[PDB]
Amino acid sequence: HMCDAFVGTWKLVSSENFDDYMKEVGVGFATRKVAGMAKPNMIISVNGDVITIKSESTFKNTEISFILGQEFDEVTADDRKVKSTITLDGGVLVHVQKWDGKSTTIKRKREDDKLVVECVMKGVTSTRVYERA
Numbered sequence: 001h002m003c004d005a006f007v008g009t010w011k012l013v014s015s016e017n018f019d020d021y022m023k024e025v026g027v028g029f030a031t032r033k034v035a036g037m038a039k040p041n042m043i044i045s046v047n048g049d050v051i052t053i054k055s056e057s058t059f060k061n062t063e064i065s066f067i068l069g070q071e072f073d074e075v076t077a078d079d080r081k082v083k084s085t086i087t088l089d090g091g092v093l094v095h096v097q098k099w100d101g102k103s104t105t106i107k108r109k110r111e112d113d114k115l116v117v118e119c120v121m122k123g124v125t126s127t128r129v130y131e132r133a
C-alpha cells in the first residue's frame with residue numbers, strides 16, 4: 001500500500017519553467033519545442049513490490065518499472081541513457097538520474113487532488129501539475 005495515493009491515470013494540467021529545465025539538462029532546440037507542447041497521460045500502477053510509471057503523449061510513450069531503492073537503466077524521453085534510483089522519502093517519490101557525470105532529481109508528491117512533479121537540475125526547477133484523468 002506504499003504508493004496507494006499515486007496509483008491511477010493522471011493528465012498534465014500545468015507546467016512552469018520546463019523549457020529552462022530542459023536547457024539545463026542539455027535537451028536540443030527541436031526536442032524542447034516538441035516535448036514542451038506535449039500533454040502527457042501518466043499512468044502509475046503497483047503489483048507487489050514493482051511500481052510501473054508510464055507516460056503517454058504525442059511526443060513519446062515511455063515506461064519504467066522498478067523496485068524502490070534498486071537502481072535501473074532508463075532511456076529518458078529526450079533519449080538520455082541514465083542510471084536511475086527511486087525511493088520514497090516522507091511520502092514523496094524521489095527519482096535521481098545519473099549520466100555523464102551529471103544528475104537530476106524528479107520528485108512526485110500528492111497535494112490535494114493533484115500529483116505535483118518537480119524536476120530539478122542545478123538551480124533550475126520545473127513544476128508540472130497533473131490531475132486525475
Ligand SMILES: CCCCCC[C@]1(C(=O)O)CC(=O)Nc2ccc(Br)cc21
Pocket residue numbers: 022027035036038040042055057059060062076077078117119128
Ligand atoms: C524531457 C525530459 C524531462 C521530462 C521531465 C518531465 C516528465 C513529466 O512531466 O512527467 C518526466 C517523466 O517521467 N516523463 C515525461 C515524459 C514526457 C515529457 Br514531455 C515529460 C516528462
